[PDB]
Each structure stands twice: as structure tokens, then as C-alpha cells.
Amino acid sequence: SMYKVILVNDDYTPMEFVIDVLQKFFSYDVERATQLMLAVHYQGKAICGVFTAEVAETKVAMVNKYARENEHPLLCTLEKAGA
């Protein structure tokens, strides 16, 4: 089972932070991280990565943990993929 790992927009989470996230938990470089960041900001969400079930859960929960400790509302989610 492949799972989309999606990052969902909110008016409050700083852009730097989303970049932080993208570099820390997906190993994207600064350049790509900004693409996706703008994507979350303007399109309202962006598929960060596609992973297998177990790995995807670990990510979601990780991203959510990190966000809550840095006191931001960023919601990161799962939902199949199919593809």
C-alpha cells in the first residue's frame, strides 16, 4: 500500500517552518522545499512524498509532533494514493 503524505494549508504556520519541515523530514533541498511551500500556500495542500503505509505513518506523526512542540497548527495527513 502506497500512501500520499500531504501537507495542508493554514494562515498561521510560518513559511520558514514549512521549509524546516521539508528539509528535516523529507531531505529536500532548499530549492524544492520552496516549490512545495508555495504550493501548500497557494494550492492549499502539497503531496510531500509517497511512501509505504508504515513509513507514512511515522512521517505524519513525526511532522505533527514537531509542529505541536514548535506551537504551530500545521496539519500533515495521509490518504491512500492508489498510484
For the chain, how big is the Rg over CA atoms in Å? 12
Side-chain half-sphere exposure of 59, counting CA atoms within 13 A = 26
Q: How many domains does the chain have?
A: 1
Integer CA distances (angstroms), 31 to 25, 36, 58, in order: 15, 9, 25
**CA gap 55, 27 in Å, rounded:** 14
77's CB contacts (< 8 A; 6+ apart) are: 5, 6, 7, 8, 60
Resolution in A: 2.9
* 4: DSSP letter: E
Residue tagged 531531505 (cell numbers): 27
Strand pairing partners for 78? 5
Domain range for 66 is 1-83
Considering only CA atoms, which of 43, 81, 76, 5 is closest in space to residue 35? 43
Experimental technique of record: X-ray
Under 8 Å between Cβ of 76 and 60: yes
Please state, in angstroms and as integers, the Cα–Cα distance from residue 20 to each residue in 10, 16, 17, 24, 67, following that order: 16, 6, 5, 6, 10
CB atoms within 10 A of CB 48: 24
CATH code for the domain in which residue 9 is found:
3.30.1390.10
